[PDB]
Amino acid sequence: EQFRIRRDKRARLLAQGRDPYPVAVPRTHTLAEVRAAHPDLPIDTATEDIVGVAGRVIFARNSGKLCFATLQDGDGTQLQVMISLDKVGQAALDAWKADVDLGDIVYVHGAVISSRELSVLADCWRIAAKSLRPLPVAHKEMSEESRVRQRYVDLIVRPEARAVARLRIAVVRAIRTALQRRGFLEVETPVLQTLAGGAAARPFATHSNALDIDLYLRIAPELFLKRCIVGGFDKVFELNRVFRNEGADSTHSPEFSMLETYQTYGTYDDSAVVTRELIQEVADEAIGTRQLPLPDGSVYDIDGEWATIQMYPSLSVALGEEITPQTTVDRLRGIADSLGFGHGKLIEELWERTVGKSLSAPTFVKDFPVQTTPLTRQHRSIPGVTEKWDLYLRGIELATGYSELSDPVVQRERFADQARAMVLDEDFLAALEYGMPPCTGTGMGIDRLLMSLTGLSIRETVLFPI
């Protein structure tokens, strides 16, 4: 309803030649600056340093001859103004009262004081924008699901949304910084693709009008990233969105930000080292500690070196017998049944369902079954496994790395099989037959990263989801 009483305040301000949506107002300082300038000014004393400030009016104590308002800027830094009868504008006080509701953006200019709390005594004052929707109190405890459909109000009423948003951006800057120190180069590769590949997932397709063909949004950059290595890039990354056309859950969203990373002349040994350094480095730049605090109240130490275990062995110890690349599916399905399609899937599942689940501290698992890794090189010695690792951080499948399958005729097979469950990406292959040097790739969910570091849910790490 009060939506109505508001629309009229605008209407009636238009009529008078008052401006409820100016083009400019001369804000000199943000409130953070007003504060940083004057840390310990003796309270109830005046300094004559003039400023033009603006921001959001949340507190309001309409008080006869003299009003009081909390200005909060968009960062959340709070200042109070004192709208007075005396130091100009009687009718200012009349307009002020009658015109200024809550959530309204409001410039005021004058001299900076403190009082019985830091405030500015206004020579001038003006509206800068006029809300026609009052801010929910916040208790009115906006549900998680309505905070996401209206993030802009969450950002205004809920301090933590401010922190999180800012954090995600700190993390991302930290990551670009980390990889640029190491001489990596950020490339842009296509989001629309004639056949999407680089991972196992159902793409989004869409129709073109230029070409009159369908096109596929990228599930992953890997394949084009590899073309760059062929093309002579030594070290490259890309940080940007992928799209996988499937259902949501606490570690899954259909569109999400994803880091991938190639570095020529190293192996999954080398790329797990970098990976861990990247994450330790990130956490510092952006959280300021490697003892990460969680809601819980507990602390998750990500400091020092991290364990590495092997899939087959580490599984073997857990099921109380030797499992190898050799173990038949009938055998495995039995064991599957004993607990609750084919070999590789059974290994990873049994692993995940016994070992993986039961990890706590940070762990790489490595040496994976070939069947489920059609892009990663075969292990250098151990037969039947590929040079790949997952990284499980606080229980979350954060990241993965490979010694990369650079051999074209092998690679042709890997896909020829896959299919049987039939056109492959024939240019991709062609590019390997030009000659891709020894490289190791990785990738990492920025969202899982934030979760694994903070405990936050996936629908809090992203600014705008649905």
Ligand X SMILES: CCOc1nc(N)nc2c1C(=O)N(C1CCCCC1)C2
Specify binding-site residues for Mg(2+).
390, 397
Segment 232 to 261, residues that bind ligand X, using CB under 6 A: 244, 252-253, 256, 258
CB–CB of 295/327 below 8 Å?
no
CB–CB of 32/73 below 8 Å?
yes
Q: Encoding tokens for residue 7?
A: 């629309």
Selection from ligand X, a second copy, ligand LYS, none that 387 binds (CB < 5 to 8 A by kind) is a second copy
Kindly tell me which residue out of 439, 444, 453, 456 binds ligand X, with binding defined by CB under 6 A.
444
Q: Tell me: does residue 88 bind a second copy (CB under 8 A).
A: no
Question: Quick one: 199 or 318, whose CB is closer to ligand X?
Answer: 199
Burial class for 199, CB neighbours closer than 10 Å (0-12, 13-18, 19+)? middle
Consecutive H or E run containing 338: helix 329-339
Of 23-31, 223-231, 288-296, 442-450, which segment contacts ligand X by CB under 6 A? 442-450
Selection from ligand X, ligand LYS, a second copy, none that 74 binds (CB < 5 to 8 A by kind) is a second copy
Selection from ligand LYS, a second copy, ligand X, none that 202 binds (CB < 5 to 8 A by kind) is a second copy
Segment 153 to 182, residues that bind a second copy, using CB under 8 A: 153-156, 162, 165-166, 168-169, 172-173, 176, 180
Which residues are registered as beta bridge partners of 51? Answer: 110
Segment 188 to 227, residues that bind ligand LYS, using CB under 6 A: 198-199, 220, 222
Q: Following CA atoms 134, 138, 141, 145 in sequence, which dihedral angle do they give, to the nearest 10 degrees?
A: 70
> Residue 19's CB: how many other CB atoms inside 10 A?
14
Kindly tell me which residue out of 71, 80, 104, 174 binds a second copy, with binding defined by CB under 8 A.
104
What's the CA gap between 230 and 433, in Å, rounded?
10
| Sign of the CA dihedral with 345 first, then 419, 237, and 191 last | negative
Q: Tell me: does residue 427 bind a second copy (CB under 8 A).
A: yes
Segment 356 to 415, residues that bind ligand X, using CB under 6 A: 397, 399-400
Kindly report the length of the chain.
466
Phi, psi (degrees; rounded to nearest 5) at 374: -75, 10
What's the CA gap between 316 and 351, in Å, rounded?
9
Kindly tell me which residue out of 279, 287, 315, 458 binds ligand X, with binding defined by CB under 6 A.
458
For residue 346, which amino acid is it?
L
Consecutive H or E run containing 264: strand 255-264
CB–CB of 377/389 below 8 Å?
no
Question: Quick one: 158 or 252, whose CB is closer to ligand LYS?
Answer: 252
For residue 357, which amino acid is it?
K
Selection from a second copy, ligand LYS, ligand X, none that 54 binds (CB < 5 to 8 A by kind) is a second copy
Closest separation in Å from C-beta 96 to ligand X = 41
Segment 241 to 270, residues that bind ligand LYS, using CB under 6 A: 260
Return the closest-CA partner of residue 301 out of 393, 391, 168. Answer: 393
Number of residues counted as binding ligand X (CB under 6 A): 14
Give percent helix, percent strand, percent coil of the chain, each to the nearest 5: 35, 25, 40
Closest-approach residue to ligand X (CB) = 445
Give the DSSP letter of residue 88.
S
Selection from ligand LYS, a second copy, ligand X, none that 445 binds (CB < 5 to 8 A by kind) is ligand X
Q: Tell me: does residue 185 bind a second copy (CB under 8 A).
A: yes
Closest separation in Å from C-beta 328 to ligand X = 28
DSSP reduced 3-state for 128: strand
Question: Quick one: 105 or 375, whose CB is closer to a second copy?
Answer: 105
Question: Quick one: 119 or 371, whose CB is closer to ligand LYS?
Answer: 371
Q: Tell me: does residue 246 bind a second copy (CB under 8 A).
A: yes
Selection from a second copy, ligand X, ligand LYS, none that 441 binds (CB < 5 to 8 A by kind) is ligand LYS
CB–CB of 257/241 below 8 Å?
yes
Kindly tell me which residue out of 400, 403, 411, 454 binds ligand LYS, with binding defined by CB under 6 A.
400
Q: Tell me: does residue 401 bind ligand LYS (CB under 6 A).
A: yes
Q: Tell me: does residue 206 bind a second copy (CB under 8 A).
A: yes
**CA 279 vs CA 98, 193, 282, 287: distances in Å:** 53, 31, 5, 11
Closest separation in Å from C-beta 42 to a second copy = 30
From residue 32 to residue 71, what is the string marking binding to ligand LYS with x (rule CB under 6 A)?
Answer: ----------------------------------------
> Which strands form 363-369's sheet, in the order they lie side by side?
185-186, 235-243, 255-264, 439-445, 396-403, 385-393, 363-369, 307-310
CB–CB of 35/118 below 8 Å?
yes
CB–CB of 91/105 below 8 Å?
no
Q: Tell me: does residue 447 bind ligand X (CB under 6 A).
A: yes
Of 113-121, 151-159, 189-197, 395-403, which segment contacts ligand LYS by CB under 6 A? 395-403
Residues of the shown chain interacting with ligand X in the complex, contacts defined by CB under 6 A: 244, 252-253, 256, 258, 397, 399-400, 443-445, 447-448, 458
Residues of the shown chain interacting with ligand LYS in the complex, contacts defined by CB under 6 A: 198-199, 220, 222, 260, 400-402, 441-443
